[model samples]
Target: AQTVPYGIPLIKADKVQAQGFKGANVKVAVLDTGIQASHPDLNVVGGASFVAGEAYNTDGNGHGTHVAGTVAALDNTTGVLGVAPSVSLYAVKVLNSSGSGSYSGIVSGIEWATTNGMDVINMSLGGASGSTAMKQAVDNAYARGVVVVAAAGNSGNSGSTNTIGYPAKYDSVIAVGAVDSNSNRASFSSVGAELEVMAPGAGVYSTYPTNTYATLNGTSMASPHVAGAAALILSKHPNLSASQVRNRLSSTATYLGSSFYYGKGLINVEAAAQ
Candidate 1:
């Protein structure tokens, strides 16, 4: 076990937990480079693989484990706690060992999550361009009442507005941007009209493969915070539609300086649950 991650309190996930919501009974699907299913801090219920010839539960790369930890690491003393510790986490392995996969694989992962009755889906992966196949998959999932959250991309530079990537750029998915401990937008976080909310991403600490922990940065780290927040909301109010959850999250965000850069603003899980 490693030191407890500070992100748990930085994002007010601790406050949300104190409010009596730990995302119980909500199903959250993590679509990424698989997960270390037996990671002690994680409560991985099950998984499926869109990657070719890979076990659904094995995380050759640690990205998925970190992402899953943010969303649903068990609330225990040994390791760390997540935003929604009681969520039913399902690993939907789309990316392979190198942290790369095709849009088709991502589409398949979305389809699997939707068919399996996932209430929320976290996609911490994206690409430069959109795919009709991917868009349709996302749309279909949204129509089935799945709250989809995705990373906006890490392509931002100081001079110009950054373009949000593929699935996140699609309206059906709630796009997330990266912020730091002080609520300042991360320099590398992509920004555009598509961005819907922001969350702590820089130096984010979470579980890793091989039963370790790591600090990582990217919009990938930010998206799962919103996913976990959504799960928390759904757990408290199970009847809220997917669209309602998305709207509630964005509407309740703590607005920053610019909507184009931060979307509605930084996610406030404690307030959003109310």
Candidate 2:
């Protein structure tokens, strides 16, 4: 059955879909483990793997495929729809099957996406320690007009500052936190200086490896939502710079009760498109 996932509407992407803006010309790179090119609901146009022997299309860990599902799963007769159903998806595998990688690997992925003319880069991965090389990569990407979005680490407290990990902590990246189905901040969603927005992360259902589906939870799951929103916004306003797109999303967002947990609030894709 064709189903609209619960989190899709929460970001107002359902309305964006109805407007006939399918993120046609945008290119989004998912810098994660890898993507399942065989997934029926996905269209992984192309990619490169930094994980040594692993191919970009091989997602033994399934995290990248699930993240890709939330970002651009096809708008088809069966399975769930993504925010930007038709956006060009590229798999940049920074991590391997064990869901682990070095900072250098991640930096390489970012650089590749940047040079490849990708409109948006969804980094649903990060670490607590900062790296100068990584920072330079993100900065360079942002300067090249690529919209960079990342996940705030899932290590939050009731009230804490500077809780987010790297990449997300960097000013150039749109740091995202996680909320539940009810728009409540997820307890594990990190709060900090760079948490720019929040999205559905708890119990999020999307595509999995082996042509399956599953429900997952993490700020990792939440980031692709924003990245998809960026794709839609870019689709509508092709000339909008990365900064402009970022501002549009933040300005159009519906505010939550707290700024610390939800900085720019929940991204409203339809509102941003308008």
Candidate 3:
């Protein structure tokens, strides 16, 4: 069965707007496949592409755009919608069209995102293994008050060998796992020490290639839900440091019955906003 998309957005919006964080000045960076900068749902501020020699971000692989749309798509009459309707996105293309990229490219994108004044960085792409460079980049962003959020692997284990994947597994980044509509951890989700929280990830409908919409699966889809929730919290408490924001989010997440798999529990944007 398809889960409801109303995890915490409904309640979070009320609290976040009360704090005056309609995401007006907050700038978030999305590092994945190139975003369709011209997509009406994804009108972003400054951006760049670092896929070796790609010019301008015209996404042929639609994952990045779909993820971006979830984080901050314009809540117009036509588009699918976003967590914060008024927030702006900063597109940084890291993953290639095949939905894969090397650790070098990922690190480079993070560096570029750092130099570009990204307030919150959402990373939905990761693979097996970790790198020193990736660690340094995540640490740098965390030190700079930039919140870095990433997806745990989809291996469906308890993060054996700490294999939730780099950046996300890197201690500094907020590693997000996936849950289903009924609030149970998805069978495909990877759980581990790095699994800090959970969010709705199954059958998610967001913007797709060519201004269309489709339902995609995986923790990649879930991480942005947390990212959007972070945006909501930060939008409300812009003064709150990224660490503070992360704390608030974790502290406020929904705590169900499950232990290891659920982490702090379901991501509660409404509570986090307050």
Candidate 4:
């Protein structure tokens, strides 16, 4: 059974907005495939393509649009609302329609977001291994006060490794795992010491191409929840550093399991927004 896209309640986004915080004035970049720039539910401020002539104007695959919607879909009567409904979104197209991209493209996307004054970057994609070049790009952004959020990868017991992949494994990035509506860790969510938090990822409802919606499951779907939460927190406290924002999320999370499986636990956006 498909559930309605109600991610706001799962992370207490409604509560955060009730307190007059809606991620306004925060710039967020969705570094994935691409986004449907004209989606009525999204307010895409800008975008760029690192895939050599591949247009970032529209999403051939729906992953990037879904991730973007989860981070900042408009609070309108026509569609589902995002965790932070008022963030300035940027489409940093790194991956292609097939949902795969080279590390160089991913690295370029990070550099673009950092150079473009993005306060938060949401990367819902990962690879099985680490890269020094990618790590440097992530570190550069973090050093310049940009919060990076990435997926822990879906390589759980079902795949070769249970550990998180690069970009997410980097020390400066906030690696996110996945959970279901019942707050149980998702079977496909990667588990390791690098995981910093968990969010609703299974059957997550969000925007898709052609003015539609979809329900997806993966750590990719979980990263944006934390990314949106970061925007909300920064909206309330404009002075908090990237590291401070990470601390707030970890410390205020609703602990539901051991640190190894669920990391600091399911994120509580309301508490973190306070």
TM-score result, candidate 2: 0.98
Error of 2 at 183 (Å): 0.5
Task: Give the range where candidate 3 is weakest over 10 consecutive residues by summed lDDT.
Answer: 1-10
**Per-candidate clash tally:** 0, 0, 3, 0
Q: Which 10 consecutive positions of candidate 4 have the poorest summed lDDT? A: 1-10
Model 1 residue 25 CA deviation (Å) reads 0.9
Which model, 1 or 3, shows the larger TM-score?
A: 1
Question: 99-193, model 3: which lDDT tens digit per residue?
Answer: 88888888988998888778889999877888989899999988988889998878786434444777788888988888776777788878777
Please provide, for model 1 over 40-157, each residue's C-alpha lDDT reduced to its tens digit, 9 standing for 90 to 100: 8987899899898998899999999999999988887767678899999999999999999998899999999999999999999999998888999999999999999999999895
Candidate 3 lDDT at 213 equals 74
Among these predictions, the greatest TM-score belongs to 2
lDDT (Cα, 0-100) at 151 in candidate 2: 92
TM-score of each: 0.97, 0.98, 0.92, 0.96
What ranking emerges by lDDT with the best candidate at the front? 2, 4, 1, 3
Top-scoring candidate (lDDT): 2
In candidate 1, the residue pairs with backbone N, CA or C atoms under 3 Å apart (3 or more residues apart, or in different chains) clash, namely none
Query: 2 or 4: which has the higher lDDT?
Result: 2
Candidate 4, TM-score vs. the true structure?
A: 0.96
Q: For model 1, where is the 10-residue window of minimal lDDT?
A: 1-10
Taking the tens digit of each residue's C-alpha lDDT, what string does model 4 give over 161-204? Answer: 45888889999999999999988899988888888899999989
